[PDB]
Amino acid sequence: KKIFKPEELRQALMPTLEALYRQDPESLPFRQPVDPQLLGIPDYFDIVKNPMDLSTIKRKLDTGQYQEPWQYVDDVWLMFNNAWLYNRKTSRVYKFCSKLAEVFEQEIDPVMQSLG
Numbered sequence: 001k002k003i004f005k006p007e008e009l010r011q012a013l014m015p016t017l018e019a020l021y022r023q024d025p026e027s028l029p030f031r032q033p034v035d036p037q038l039l040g041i042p043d044y045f046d047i048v049k050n051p052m053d054l055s056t057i058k059r060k061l062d063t064g065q066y067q068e069p070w071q072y073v074d075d076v077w078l079m080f081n082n083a084w085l086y087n088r089k090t091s092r093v094y095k096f097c098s099k100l101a102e103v104f105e106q107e108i109d110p111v112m113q114s115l116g
């Protein structure tokens, strides 16, 4: 149990999010919210109940809307789980998601220990 300052969470967690942005082109389909009408995928919101993307996570850090570090981690995992759920395992976006998940898994473990 701990009260976290939003600036403390930003300085600690934003580097792990930037490590995902730096993956090019793997991060490109994750940088903005999925737009099913534009992309022609009307079943997306049938499958994905709670969408999440990098720009939404970044804004929540910038505005202090995470109270605790595990809320940030849950949003990153939600973004990954949505992409693995909707896209087929042979697809470009599914393989992109696995690469981003590999990067995040290596970045987030010591950061979470330092925060407590």
Ligand SMILES: CNC(=O)N1C[C@@H](C)Oc2cc(C)ccc21
Binding pocket: 028, 029, 030, 034, 035, 039, 041, 082, 083, 086, 087, 093
């Ligand atoms: C995590 N992204 C994602 O699931 N999608 C759905 C997939 C069918 O293709 C996409 C293409 C573009 C340009 C942006 C997002 C996506």
